[PDB]
Amino acid sequence: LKKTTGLVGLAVCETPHERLKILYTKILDVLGQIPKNAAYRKYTEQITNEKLGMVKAEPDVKKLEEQLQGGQIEEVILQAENELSLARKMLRWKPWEPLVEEPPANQWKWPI
Template identity: 40%
Template sequence: MGLEGLVACDSPHERPDGKKLKDHIQGGRIEEGILQAAEELSLARKMIQWKPRAP
């Protein structure tokens, strides 16, 4: 199952800005990032069940 109209990134692990990530972690906000990622994953799973379609 793929997403239509979106280009897949072949190397997502190379995309994050290392300095931004390091600053984010040192700022004590890594927990916020983890929670946000968990919420986005939950939404993605729901979207698969809902099977939304573009008009």
């Protein structure tokens, strides 16, 4: 097992496969409450399903790190946690609704 991942404050995760699987399952479960037509739901479901399929089909770590294209698997777990938190916040926010209101007539007109 490798030691001193290199990023200060980031600890080495033993058995990262189980942590990644649990985090991805929780992300999918939270996404299940978002309405179907929301683009966030389908996009994040596709990304998470791809990551879960790649993590379940590779027992190694270095090869899994190369395949995930994130590198340093611990920060991949960190990004999974960040995505889960964002998914919960987004379920709270509900940004799939239409626009709040149009801007004024020449709000974004440049020059002047």
